[PDB]
PDB file of C-alpha atoms and ligand atoms in Angstrom:
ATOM      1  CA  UNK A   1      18.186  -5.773  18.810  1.00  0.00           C
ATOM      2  CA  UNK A   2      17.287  -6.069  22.344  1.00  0.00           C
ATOM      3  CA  UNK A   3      15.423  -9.886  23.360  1.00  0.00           C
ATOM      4  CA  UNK A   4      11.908  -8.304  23.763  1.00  0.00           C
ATOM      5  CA  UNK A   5      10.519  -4.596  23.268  1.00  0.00           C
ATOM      6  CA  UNK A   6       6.933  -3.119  24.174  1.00  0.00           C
ATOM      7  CA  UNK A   7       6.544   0.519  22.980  1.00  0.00           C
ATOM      8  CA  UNK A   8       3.297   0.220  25.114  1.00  0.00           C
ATOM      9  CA  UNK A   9       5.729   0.611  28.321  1.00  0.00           C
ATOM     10  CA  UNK A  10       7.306   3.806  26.807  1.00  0.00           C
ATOM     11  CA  UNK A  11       4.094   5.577  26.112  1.00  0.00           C
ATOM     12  CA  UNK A  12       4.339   5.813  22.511  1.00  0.00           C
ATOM     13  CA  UNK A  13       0.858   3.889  22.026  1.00  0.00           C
ATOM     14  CA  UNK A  14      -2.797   5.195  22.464  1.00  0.00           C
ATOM     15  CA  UNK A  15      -5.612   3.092  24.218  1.00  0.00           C
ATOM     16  CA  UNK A  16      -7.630  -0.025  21.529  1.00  0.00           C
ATOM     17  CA  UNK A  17      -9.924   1.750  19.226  1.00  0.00           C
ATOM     18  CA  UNK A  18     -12.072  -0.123  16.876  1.00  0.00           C
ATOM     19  CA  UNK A  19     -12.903   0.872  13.613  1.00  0.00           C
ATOM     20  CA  UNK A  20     -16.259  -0.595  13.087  1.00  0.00           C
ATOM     21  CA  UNK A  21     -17.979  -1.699  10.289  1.00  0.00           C
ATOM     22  CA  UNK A  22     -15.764   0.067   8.177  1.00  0.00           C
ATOM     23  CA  UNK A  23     -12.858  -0.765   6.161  1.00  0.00           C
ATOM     24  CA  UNK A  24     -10.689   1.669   7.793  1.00  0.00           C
ATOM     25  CA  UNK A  25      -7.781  -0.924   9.418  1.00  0.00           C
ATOM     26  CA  UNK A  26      -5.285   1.160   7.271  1.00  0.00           C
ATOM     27  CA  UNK A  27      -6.670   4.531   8.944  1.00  0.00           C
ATOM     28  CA  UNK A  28      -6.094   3.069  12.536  1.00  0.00           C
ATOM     29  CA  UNK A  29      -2.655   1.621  11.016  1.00  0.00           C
ATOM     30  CA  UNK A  30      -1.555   4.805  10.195  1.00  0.00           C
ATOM     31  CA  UNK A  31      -2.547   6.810  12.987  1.00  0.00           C
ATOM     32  CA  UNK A  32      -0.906   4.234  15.390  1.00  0.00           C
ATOM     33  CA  UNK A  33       2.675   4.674  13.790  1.00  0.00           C
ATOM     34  CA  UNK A  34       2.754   8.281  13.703  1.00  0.00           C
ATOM     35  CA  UNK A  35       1.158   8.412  17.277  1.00  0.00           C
ATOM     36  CA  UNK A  36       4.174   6.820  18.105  1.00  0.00           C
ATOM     37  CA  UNK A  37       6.614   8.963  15.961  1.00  0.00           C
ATOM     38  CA  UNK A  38       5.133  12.296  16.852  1.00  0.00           C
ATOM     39  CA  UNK A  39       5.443  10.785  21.041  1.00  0.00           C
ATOM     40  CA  UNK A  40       8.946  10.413  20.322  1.00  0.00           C
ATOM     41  CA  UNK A  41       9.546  13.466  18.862  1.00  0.00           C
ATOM     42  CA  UNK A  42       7.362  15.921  21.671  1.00  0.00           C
ATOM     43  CA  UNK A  43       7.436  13.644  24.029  1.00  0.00           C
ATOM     44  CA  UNK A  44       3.091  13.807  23.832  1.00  0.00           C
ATOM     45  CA  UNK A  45       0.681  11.801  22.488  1.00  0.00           C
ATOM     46  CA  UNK A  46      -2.085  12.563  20.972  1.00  0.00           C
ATOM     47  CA  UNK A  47      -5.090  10.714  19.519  1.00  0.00           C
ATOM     48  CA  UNK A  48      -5.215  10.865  15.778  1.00  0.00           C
ATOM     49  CA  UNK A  49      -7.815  11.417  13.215  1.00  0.00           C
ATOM     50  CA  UNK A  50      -8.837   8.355  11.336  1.00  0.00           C
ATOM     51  CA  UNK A  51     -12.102   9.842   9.947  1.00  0.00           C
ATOM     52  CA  UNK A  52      -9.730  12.704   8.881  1.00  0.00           C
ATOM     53  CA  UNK A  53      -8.171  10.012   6.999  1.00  0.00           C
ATOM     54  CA  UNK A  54     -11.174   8.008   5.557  1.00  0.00           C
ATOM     55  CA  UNK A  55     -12.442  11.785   4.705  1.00  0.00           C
ATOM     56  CA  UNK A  56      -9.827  13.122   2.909  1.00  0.00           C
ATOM     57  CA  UNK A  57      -7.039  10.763   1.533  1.00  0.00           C
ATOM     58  CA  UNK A  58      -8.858  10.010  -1.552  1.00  0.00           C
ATOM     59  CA  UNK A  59      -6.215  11.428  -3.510  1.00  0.00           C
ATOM     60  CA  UNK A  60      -3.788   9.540  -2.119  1.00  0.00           C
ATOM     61  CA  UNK A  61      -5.115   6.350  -3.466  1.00  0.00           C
ATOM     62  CA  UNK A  62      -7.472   5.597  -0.100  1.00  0.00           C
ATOM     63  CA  UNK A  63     -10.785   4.469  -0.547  1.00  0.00           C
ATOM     64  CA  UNK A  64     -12.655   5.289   2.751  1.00  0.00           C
ATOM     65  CA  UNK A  65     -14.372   1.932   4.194  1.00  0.00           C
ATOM     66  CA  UNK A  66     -13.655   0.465   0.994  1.00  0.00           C
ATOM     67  CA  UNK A  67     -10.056  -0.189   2.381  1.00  0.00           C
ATOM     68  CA  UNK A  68      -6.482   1.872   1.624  1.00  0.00           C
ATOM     69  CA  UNK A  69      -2.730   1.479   2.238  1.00  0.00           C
ATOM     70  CA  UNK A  70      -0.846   3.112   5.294  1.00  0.00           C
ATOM     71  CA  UNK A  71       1.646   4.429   2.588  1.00  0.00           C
ATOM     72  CA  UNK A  72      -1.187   6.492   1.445  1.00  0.00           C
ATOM     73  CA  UNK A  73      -2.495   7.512   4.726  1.00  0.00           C
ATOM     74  CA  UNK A  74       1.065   9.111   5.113  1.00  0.00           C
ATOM     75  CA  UNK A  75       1.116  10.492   2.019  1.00  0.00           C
ATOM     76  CA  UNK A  76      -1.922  12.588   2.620  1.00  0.00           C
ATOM     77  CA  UNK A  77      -0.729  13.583   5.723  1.00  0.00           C
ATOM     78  CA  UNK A  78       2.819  15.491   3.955  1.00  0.00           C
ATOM     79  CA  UNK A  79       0.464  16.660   0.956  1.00  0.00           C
ATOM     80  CA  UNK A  80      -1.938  18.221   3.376  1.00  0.00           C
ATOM     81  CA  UNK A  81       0.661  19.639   5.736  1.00  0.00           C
ATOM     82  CA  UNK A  82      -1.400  17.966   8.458  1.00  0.00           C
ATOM     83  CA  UNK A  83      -3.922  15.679  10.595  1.00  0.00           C
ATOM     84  CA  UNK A  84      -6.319  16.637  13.284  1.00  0.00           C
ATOM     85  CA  UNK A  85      -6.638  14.981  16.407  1.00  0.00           C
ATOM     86  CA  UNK A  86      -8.846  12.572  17.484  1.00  0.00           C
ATOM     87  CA  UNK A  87     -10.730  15.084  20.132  1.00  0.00           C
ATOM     88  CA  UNK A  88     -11.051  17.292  17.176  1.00  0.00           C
ATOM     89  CA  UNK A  89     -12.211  15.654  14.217  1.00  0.00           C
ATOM     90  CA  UNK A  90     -13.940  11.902  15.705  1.00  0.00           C
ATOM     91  CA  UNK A  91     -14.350   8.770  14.576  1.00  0.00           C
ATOM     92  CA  UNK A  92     -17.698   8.251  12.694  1.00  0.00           C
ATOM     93  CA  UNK A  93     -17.013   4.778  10.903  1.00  0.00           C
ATOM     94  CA  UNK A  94     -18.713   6.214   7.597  1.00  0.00           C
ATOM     95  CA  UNK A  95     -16.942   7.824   4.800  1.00  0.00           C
ATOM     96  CA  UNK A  96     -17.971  11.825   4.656  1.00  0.00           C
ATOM     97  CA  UNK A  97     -16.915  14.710   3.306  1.00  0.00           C
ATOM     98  CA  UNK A  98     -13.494  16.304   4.026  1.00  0.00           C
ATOM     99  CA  UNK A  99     -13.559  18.661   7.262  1.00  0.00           C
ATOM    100  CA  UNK A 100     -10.245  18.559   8.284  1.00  0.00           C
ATOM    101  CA  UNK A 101      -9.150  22.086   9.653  1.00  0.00           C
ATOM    102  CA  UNK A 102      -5.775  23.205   9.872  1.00  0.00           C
ATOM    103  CA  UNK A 103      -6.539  24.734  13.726  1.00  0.00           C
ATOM    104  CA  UNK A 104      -6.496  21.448  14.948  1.00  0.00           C
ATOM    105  CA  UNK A 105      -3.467  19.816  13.279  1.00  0.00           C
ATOM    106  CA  UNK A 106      -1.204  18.302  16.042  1.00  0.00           C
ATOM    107  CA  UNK A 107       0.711  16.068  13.521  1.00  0.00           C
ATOM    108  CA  UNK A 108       2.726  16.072  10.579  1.00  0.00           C
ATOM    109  CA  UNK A 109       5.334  13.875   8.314  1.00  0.00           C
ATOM    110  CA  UNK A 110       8.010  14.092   5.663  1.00  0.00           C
ATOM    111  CA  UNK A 111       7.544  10.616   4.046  1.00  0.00           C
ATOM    112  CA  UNK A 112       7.447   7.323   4.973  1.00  0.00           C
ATOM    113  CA  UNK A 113      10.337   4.483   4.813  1.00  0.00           C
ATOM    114  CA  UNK A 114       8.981   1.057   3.602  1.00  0.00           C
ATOM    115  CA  UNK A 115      10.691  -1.994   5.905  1.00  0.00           C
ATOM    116  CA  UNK A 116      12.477  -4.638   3.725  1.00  0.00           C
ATOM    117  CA  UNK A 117      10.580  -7.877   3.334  1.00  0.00           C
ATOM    118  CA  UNK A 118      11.982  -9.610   6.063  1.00  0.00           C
ATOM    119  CA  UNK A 119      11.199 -10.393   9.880  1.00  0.00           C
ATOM    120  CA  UNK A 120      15.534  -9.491  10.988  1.00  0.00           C
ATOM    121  CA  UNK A 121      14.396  -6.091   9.160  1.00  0.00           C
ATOM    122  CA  UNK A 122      11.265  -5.584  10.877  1.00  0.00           C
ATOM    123  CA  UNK A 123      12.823  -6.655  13.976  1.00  0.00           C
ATOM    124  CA  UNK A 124      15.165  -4.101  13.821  1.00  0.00           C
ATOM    125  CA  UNK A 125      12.886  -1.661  13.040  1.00  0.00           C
ATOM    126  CA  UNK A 126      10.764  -2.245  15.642  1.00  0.00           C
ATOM    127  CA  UNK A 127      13.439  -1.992  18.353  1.00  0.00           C
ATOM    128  CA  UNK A 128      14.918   1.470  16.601  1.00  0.00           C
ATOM    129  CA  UNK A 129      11.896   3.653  15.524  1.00  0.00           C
ATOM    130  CA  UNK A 130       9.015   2.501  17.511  1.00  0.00           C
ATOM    131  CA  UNK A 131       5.742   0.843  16.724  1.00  0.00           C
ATOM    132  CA  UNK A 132       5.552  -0.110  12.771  1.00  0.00           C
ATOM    133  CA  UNK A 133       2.398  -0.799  10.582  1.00  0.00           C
ATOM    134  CA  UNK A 134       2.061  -3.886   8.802  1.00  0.00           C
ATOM    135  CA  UNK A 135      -0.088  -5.616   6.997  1.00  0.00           C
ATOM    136  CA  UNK A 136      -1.476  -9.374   7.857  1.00  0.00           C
ATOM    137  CA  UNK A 137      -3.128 -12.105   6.103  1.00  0.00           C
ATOM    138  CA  UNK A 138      -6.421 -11.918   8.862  1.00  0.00           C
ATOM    139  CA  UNK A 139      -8.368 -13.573   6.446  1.00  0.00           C
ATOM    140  CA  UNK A 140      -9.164 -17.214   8.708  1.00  0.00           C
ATOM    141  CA  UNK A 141     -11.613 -17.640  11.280  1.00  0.00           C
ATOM    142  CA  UNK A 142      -8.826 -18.099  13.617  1.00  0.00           C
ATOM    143  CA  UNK A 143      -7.568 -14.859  13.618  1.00  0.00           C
ATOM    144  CA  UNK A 144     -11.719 -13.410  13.811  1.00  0.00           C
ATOM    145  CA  UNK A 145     -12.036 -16.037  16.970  1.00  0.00           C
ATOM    146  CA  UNK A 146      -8.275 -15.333  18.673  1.00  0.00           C
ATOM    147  CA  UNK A 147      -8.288 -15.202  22.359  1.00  0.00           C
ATOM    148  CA  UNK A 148      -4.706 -15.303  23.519  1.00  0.00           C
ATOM    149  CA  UNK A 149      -1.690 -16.804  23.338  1.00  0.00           C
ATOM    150  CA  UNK A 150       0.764 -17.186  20.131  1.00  0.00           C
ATOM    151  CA  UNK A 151      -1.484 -16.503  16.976  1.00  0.00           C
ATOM    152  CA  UNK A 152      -0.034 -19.697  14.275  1.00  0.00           C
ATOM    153  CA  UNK A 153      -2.275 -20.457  11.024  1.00  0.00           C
ATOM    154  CA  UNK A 154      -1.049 -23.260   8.582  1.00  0.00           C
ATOM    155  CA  UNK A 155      -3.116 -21.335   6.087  1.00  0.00           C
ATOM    156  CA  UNK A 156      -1.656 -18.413   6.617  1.00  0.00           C
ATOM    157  CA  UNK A 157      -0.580 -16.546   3.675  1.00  0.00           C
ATOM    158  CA  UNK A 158       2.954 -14.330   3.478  1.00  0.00           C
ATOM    159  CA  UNK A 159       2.023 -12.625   0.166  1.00  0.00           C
ATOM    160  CA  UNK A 160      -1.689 -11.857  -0.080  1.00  0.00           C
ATOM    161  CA  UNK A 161      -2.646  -9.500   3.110  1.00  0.00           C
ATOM    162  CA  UNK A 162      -6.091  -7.991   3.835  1.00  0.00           C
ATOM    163  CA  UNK A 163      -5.557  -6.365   6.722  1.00  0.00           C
ATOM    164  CA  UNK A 164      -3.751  -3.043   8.512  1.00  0.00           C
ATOM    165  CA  UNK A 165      -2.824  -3.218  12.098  1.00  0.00           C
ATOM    166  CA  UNK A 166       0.312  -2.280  14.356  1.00  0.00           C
ATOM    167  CA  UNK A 167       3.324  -3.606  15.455  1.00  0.00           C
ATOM    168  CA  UNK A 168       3.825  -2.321  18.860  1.00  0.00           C
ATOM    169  CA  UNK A 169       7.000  -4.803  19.827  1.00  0.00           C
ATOM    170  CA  UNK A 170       7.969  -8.710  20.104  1.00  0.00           C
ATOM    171  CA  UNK A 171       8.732 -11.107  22.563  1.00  0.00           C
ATOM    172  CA  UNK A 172       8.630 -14.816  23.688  1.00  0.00           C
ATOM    173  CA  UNK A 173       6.672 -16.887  25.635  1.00  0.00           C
ATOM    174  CA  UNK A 174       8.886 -18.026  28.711  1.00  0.00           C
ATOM    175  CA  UNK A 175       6.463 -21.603  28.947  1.00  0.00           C
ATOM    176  CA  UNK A 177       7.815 -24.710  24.880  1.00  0.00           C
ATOM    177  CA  UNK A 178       9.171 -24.429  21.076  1.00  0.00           C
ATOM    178  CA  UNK A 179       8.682 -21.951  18.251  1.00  0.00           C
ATOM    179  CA  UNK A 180       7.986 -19.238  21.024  1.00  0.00           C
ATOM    180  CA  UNK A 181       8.418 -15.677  19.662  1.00  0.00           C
ATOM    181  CA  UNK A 182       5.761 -13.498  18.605  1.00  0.00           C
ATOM    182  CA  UNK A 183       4.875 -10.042  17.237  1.00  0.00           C
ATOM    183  CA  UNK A 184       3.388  -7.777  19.699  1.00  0.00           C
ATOM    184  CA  UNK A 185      -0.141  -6.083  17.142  1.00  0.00           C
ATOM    185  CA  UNK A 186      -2.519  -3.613  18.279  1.00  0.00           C
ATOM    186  CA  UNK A 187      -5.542  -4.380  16.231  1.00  0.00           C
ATOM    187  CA  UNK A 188      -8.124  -1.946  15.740  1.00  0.00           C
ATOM    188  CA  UNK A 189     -11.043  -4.320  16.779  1.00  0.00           C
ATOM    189  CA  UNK A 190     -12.082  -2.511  20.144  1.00  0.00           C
ATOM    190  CA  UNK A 191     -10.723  -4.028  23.549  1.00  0.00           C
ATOM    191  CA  UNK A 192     -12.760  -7.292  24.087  1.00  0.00           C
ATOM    192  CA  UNK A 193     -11.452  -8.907  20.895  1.00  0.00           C
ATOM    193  CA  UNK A 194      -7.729 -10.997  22.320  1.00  0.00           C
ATOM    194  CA  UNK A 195      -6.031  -9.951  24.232  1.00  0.00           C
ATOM    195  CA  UNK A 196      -6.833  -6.518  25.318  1.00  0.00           C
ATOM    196  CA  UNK A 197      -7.103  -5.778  21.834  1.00  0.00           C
ATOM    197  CA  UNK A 198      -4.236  -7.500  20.728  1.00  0.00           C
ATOM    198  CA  UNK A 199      -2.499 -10.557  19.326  1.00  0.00           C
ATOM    199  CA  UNK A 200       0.586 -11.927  19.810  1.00  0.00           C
ATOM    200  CA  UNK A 201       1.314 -13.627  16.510  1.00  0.00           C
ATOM    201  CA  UNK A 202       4.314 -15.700  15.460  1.00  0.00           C
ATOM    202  CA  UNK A 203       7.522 -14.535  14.726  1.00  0.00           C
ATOM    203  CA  UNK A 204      10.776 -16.278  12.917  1.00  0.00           C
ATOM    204  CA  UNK A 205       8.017 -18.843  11.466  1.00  0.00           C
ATOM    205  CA  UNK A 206       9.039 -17.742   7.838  1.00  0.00           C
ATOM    206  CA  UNK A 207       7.109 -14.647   7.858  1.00  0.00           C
ATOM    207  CA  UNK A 208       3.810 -15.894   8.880  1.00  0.00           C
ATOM    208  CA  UNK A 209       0.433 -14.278   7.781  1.00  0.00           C
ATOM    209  CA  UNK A 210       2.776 -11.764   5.975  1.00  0.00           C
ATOM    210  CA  UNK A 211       3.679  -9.606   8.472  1.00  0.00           C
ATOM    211  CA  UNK A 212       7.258  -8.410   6.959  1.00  0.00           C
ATOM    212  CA  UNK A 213       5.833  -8.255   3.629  1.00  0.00           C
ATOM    213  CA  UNK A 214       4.353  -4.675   4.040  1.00  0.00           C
ATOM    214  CA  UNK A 215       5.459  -2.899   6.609  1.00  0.00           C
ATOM    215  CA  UNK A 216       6.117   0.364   7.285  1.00  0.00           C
ATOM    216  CA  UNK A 217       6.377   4.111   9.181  1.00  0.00           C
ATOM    217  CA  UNK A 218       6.191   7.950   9.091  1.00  0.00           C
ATOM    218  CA  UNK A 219       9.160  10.170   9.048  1.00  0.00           C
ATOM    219  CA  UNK A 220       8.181  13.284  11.335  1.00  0.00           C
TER     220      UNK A 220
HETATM  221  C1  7KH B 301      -9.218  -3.014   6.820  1.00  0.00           C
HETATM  222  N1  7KH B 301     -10.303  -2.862   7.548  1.00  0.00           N
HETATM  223  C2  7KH B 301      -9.227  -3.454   5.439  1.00  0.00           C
HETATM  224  N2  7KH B 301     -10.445  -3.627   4.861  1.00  0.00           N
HETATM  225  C3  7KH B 301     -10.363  -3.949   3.583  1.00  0.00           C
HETATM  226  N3  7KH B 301     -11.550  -4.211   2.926  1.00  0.00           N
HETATM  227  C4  7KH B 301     -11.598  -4.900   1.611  1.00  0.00           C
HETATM  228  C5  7KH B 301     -12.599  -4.066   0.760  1.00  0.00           C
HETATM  229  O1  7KH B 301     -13.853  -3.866   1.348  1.00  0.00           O
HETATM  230  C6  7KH B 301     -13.899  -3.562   2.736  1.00  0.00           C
HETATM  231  C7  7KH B 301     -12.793  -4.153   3.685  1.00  0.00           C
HETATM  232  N4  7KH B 301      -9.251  -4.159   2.880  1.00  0.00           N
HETATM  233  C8  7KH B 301      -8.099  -4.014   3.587  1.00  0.00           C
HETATM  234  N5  7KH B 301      -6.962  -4.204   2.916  1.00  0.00           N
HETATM  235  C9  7KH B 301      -6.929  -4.460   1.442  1.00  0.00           C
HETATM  236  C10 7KH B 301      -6.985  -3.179   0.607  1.00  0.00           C
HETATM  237  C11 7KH B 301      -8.097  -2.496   0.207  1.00  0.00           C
HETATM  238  N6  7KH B 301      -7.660  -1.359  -0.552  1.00  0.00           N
HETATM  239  C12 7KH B 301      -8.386  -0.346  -1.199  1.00  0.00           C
HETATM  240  C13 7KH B 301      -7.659   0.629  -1.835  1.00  0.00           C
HETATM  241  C14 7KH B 301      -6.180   0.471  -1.781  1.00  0.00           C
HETATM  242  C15 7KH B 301      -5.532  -0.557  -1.175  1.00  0.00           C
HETATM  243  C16 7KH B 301      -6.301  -1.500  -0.535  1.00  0.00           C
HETATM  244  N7  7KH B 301      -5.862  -2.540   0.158  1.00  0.00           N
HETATM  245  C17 7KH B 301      -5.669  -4.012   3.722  1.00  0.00           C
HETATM  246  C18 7KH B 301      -5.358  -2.514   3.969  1.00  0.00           C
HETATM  247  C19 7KH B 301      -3.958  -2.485   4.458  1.00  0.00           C
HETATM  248  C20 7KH B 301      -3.337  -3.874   4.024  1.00  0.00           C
HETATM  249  C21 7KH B 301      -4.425  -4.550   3.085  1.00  0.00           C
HETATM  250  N8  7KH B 301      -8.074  -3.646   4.854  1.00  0.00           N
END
C-alpha cells in the first residue's frame, strides 16, 4: 500500500456537509463512499441524497435522525434500484416522508463488502477502492472540541462506536513518534477541525474503533 493516499486529490470526494441536529452521520457516511465509487466508475461526481436516505431506508433497518448503519444505507440503495442527487432531493435534517423519484437517480450499487477488523485491512482498502466508511467511538469531548493535528483519546473505545464518518486516506505527520493517522471527512460542516476533518491515529491498536466497522458500496 502506497506511504500516504488522499482520495481528496483524485476528486473522488464532495465538499464538508453537516448533518445537523440530526442523527444522520450514517446518511453522510454512506453517501461519501459511493460518491467516491460512482467518481471512479463515470469519472463524475455527484452530490448524494442523504434526506433520500433518512426518508426512505426504513426498511433497511435505518431509523432517520434516530441513527442507522451505512450497511443499510447501501442496502436501500440496491433494493430501490437507486438514490437521487443532492440538487434533486436536499438536505432537510428532519425525517419526512419518502419522495425519492426515480428521474433523478444518478447512483446505484450491487452490495456492499464489509472490511475485516483490522487497520492492515482497512489500509489496504483504502489505498485500492477509494474512500471507506467507518464507524468511530466520537463519544469524548475531545473529539466534539478537535482542532487539528493527530486525534489520540486514552478513552477511546475499539468496540462500542457511535458515530458514521469517512475515511478519505492516511498519512503521517513529517514533525515526532506514533505519527500516522486516518484521513475522516466528518459530516459536522467546515468550521469544526480541520476543514471538516480529523486526522485520527492510526497503527495505535485500532483506536476509537475505526477498523471495527468499516465498509463500501459495490457499483
Ligand atoms: C450519527 N449522527 C449517529 N447518531 C446516532 N444517534 C444515537 C441515537 O439518537 C440520535 C444520535 N447514533 C449513531 N450511531 C449508533 C446507531 C444508531 N442506530 C439506529 C439504528 C441502527 C443502528 C444504529 N447505530 C452510529 C451510526 C453508524 C455507526 C454507529 N450515529
Amino acid at each position: 500500500a502506497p506511504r500516504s493516499v488522499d482520495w481528496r486529490e483524485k476528486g473522488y470526494v464532495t465538499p464538508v456537509k453537516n448533518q445537523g441536529q440530526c442523527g444522520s452521520c450514517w446518511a453522510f457516511s454512506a453517501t461519501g463512499a459511493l460518491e467516491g465509487q460512482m467518481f471512479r466508475k463515470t469519472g463524475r461526481l455527484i452530490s448524494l441524497s442523504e434526506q433520500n436516505l433518512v426518508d426512505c431506508s426504513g426498511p433497511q433497518g435505518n431509523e432517520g435522525c434516530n441513527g442507522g448503519l451505512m450497511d443499510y444505507a447501501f442496502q436501500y440503495v440496491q433494493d430501490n434500484g437507486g438514490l437521487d442527487s443532492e440538487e434533486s432531493y436536499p438536505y432537510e435534517a428532519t425525517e419526512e416522508s419518502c419522495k425519492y423519484n426515480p428521474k433523478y437517480s444518478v447512483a446505484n450499487d450491487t452490495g456492499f463488502v464489509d472490511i475485516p477488523k483490522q487497520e492492515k485491512a482497512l489500509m489496504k482498502a483504502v489505498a485500492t477502492v477509494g474512500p471507506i466508511s467507518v464507524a468511530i467511538d466520537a463519544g469524548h469531548e475531545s473529539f466534539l472540541f478537535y482542532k487539528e493535528g493527530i486525534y489520540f483519546e486514552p478513552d477511546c473505545s475499539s468496540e462500542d462506536m457511535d458515530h458514521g464518518v469517512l475515511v478519505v486516506g492516511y498519512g503521517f505527520e513529517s514533525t515526532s513518534d506514533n505519527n500516522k493517522y486516518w484521513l475522516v471527512k466528518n459530516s459536522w460542516g467546515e468550521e469544526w477541525g480541520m476543514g471538516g476533518y480529523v486526522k485520527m491515529a492510526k497503527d495505535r491498536r485500532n483506536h476509537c474503533g475505526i477498523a471495527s466497522a468499516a465498509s463500501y458500496p459495490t457499483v
